Design a protein around this ligand. Structure first.
Ligand SMILES: C[C@@H](O[C@H]1OCCN(Cc2nc(=O)[nH][nH]2)[C@H]1c1ccc(F)cc1)c1cc(C(F)(F)F)cc(C(F)(F)F)c1
Length: 398
């Protein structure tokens, strides 16, 4: 019942913001990658496909979806009725599976470096396939879309053939929802956790192999022997118990080098770590004879005590971590934007009367705004979290 003019203009402005920032932003992103030829990096080829799918959905559907929702009248005829119901499914499938292709490409480059799967022709055939499967999946929704002509208006409504309980319509809707939301997010979710652990995490075995032809060193049995010994030692047990897993590895690393007795000698530094005075302990340990004899190892161990991270046992400058952080954000943005949408359309099966009663028009206009805003965020994310992308946007200015 809430229908004031003060609100409609305020919403129309909120919706145009989407159409402009999505077209402007994604046309520039497509330009940055395609024109440079140095930028054509397989991951960026899928980002072009994602930028096209985004920009297309904003241009074709935003005006048409907003006007129908505001006036409850279909102005654009039977063809555009079929088209506005077909295109969003195809464009969302293409977007989320281009994101999955990027995730699979990173997973392959990071976890399986010896088996290459990146090829310019293959990337083109993947993008080609993604779109074929997207248009096929969207087809039944477009096929059953039609107009109904009435005395005061025209109505665009989707009508499936009459069946005892309309199973095919409900099965189709669930299948689309799984293919464009739940399933690819599970695949991307899997890929970036494994990749995330590889790029950011580490362990004592990884550590000891770096700090310590010839026979292979057996750390497995000695690490457990080193833990059993520290917990038997009165001078080392309170410190060790107080420490997080990362710092515990730094303390064990020291025991592997000097032994239980030699480590127990650093009484002051061990009390600093126990008191959680990291920088103080780091400063005192760099003054030791141990640091003098082996500065490179000691600097790595000290950094582990100072930061409480695996930073010393990973590369300093990595273009790999920059992309993975950027793409994790993009996917999390997608998952957020589409969740209320899918719940809104999933609910007519659980509680059919719950929607129609209240002022769901202001609810739907908020929910549809969120869903459609997923189309404009990606260029913004690229400028904030990537150097070469933000410099590319600056170059497109007169
Ligand atoms: C075309 C439209 O579809 C909805 O509105 C019509 C009925 N339809 C329920 C139904 N009736 C059937 O017969 N099948 N499904 C809805 C629906 C269909 C599939 C879904 F996965 C979710 C909702 C739609 C779909 C998406 C998408 F693709 F992202 F989902 C995004 C957007 C936009 F962002 F532009 F507003 C619009």
């Amino acid at each position: 019942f809430v229908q004031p003019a003060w609100q409609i203009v305020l919403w129309a402005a909120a919706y145009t913001v989407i159409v402009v920032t999505s077209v402007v932003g994604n046309v520039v992103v497509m330009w940055i990658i395609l024109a440079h030829k140095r930028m054509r990096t397989v991951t960026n080829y899928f980002l072009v496909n994602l930028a096209f799918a985004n920009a297309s959905m904003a241009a074709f559907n935003t005006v048409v979806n907003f006007t129908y929702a505001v006036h409850n009248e279909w102005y654009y005829g039977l063809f555009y009725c079929k088209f506005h119901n077909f295109f969003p499914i195809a464009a969302v499938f293409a977007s989320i599976w281009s994101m999955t292709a990027v995730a699979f490409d990173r997973y392959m480059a990071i976890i399986h470096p010896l088996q290459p799967r990146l090829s310019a022709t293959a990337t083109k055939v993947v993008i080609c396939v993604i779109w074929v499967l997207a248009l096929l999946l969207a087809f039944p929704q477009g096929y059953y879309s039609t107009t109904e002509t009435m005395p005061s208006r025209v109505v665009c409504m989707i009508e499936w053939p009459e069946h005892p309980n309309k199973i095919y319509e409900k099965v189709y809707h669930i299948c689309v929802t799984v293919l464009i939301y739940f399933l690819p997010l599970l695949v991307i979710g899997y890929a970036y956790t494994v990749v995330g652990i590889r790029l950011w995490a580490s362990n004592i075995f990884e550590m000891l192999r770096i700090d310590e032809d010839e026979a292979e060193k057996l750390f497995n049995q000695d690490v457990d022997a080193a833990v059993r010994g520290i917990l038997r030692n009165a001078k080392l047990k309170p410190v060790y118990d107080s420490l997080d897993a990362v710092r515990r590895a730094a303390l064990i690393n020291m025991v592997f080098q000097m032994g239980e007795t030699g480590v127990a000698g650093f009484t002051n530094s061990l009390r600093m770590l126990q008191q959680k005075r990291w920088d103080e302990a780091a400063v005192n340990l760099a003054k030791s004879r141990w640091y003098n004899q082996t500065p490179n190892r000691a600097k790595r161990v000290i950094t582990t005590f100072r930061t409480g991270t695996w930073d010393a046992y990973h590369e300093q400058v990595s273009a790999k971590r920059k992309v993975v952080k950027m793409m994790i954000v993009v996917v999390c943005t997608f998952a957020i934007c589409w969740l209320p949408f899918h719940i809104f359309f999933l609910l007519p099966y659980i509680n059919p009367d719950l929607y129609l009663k209240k002022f769901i028009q202001q609810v739907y206009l908020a929910i549809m705004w969120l869903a459609m805003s997923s189309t404009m965020y990606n260029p913004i994310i690229y400028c904030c979290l990537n150097d070469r992308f933000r410099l590319g946007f600056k170059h497109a200015f007169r």
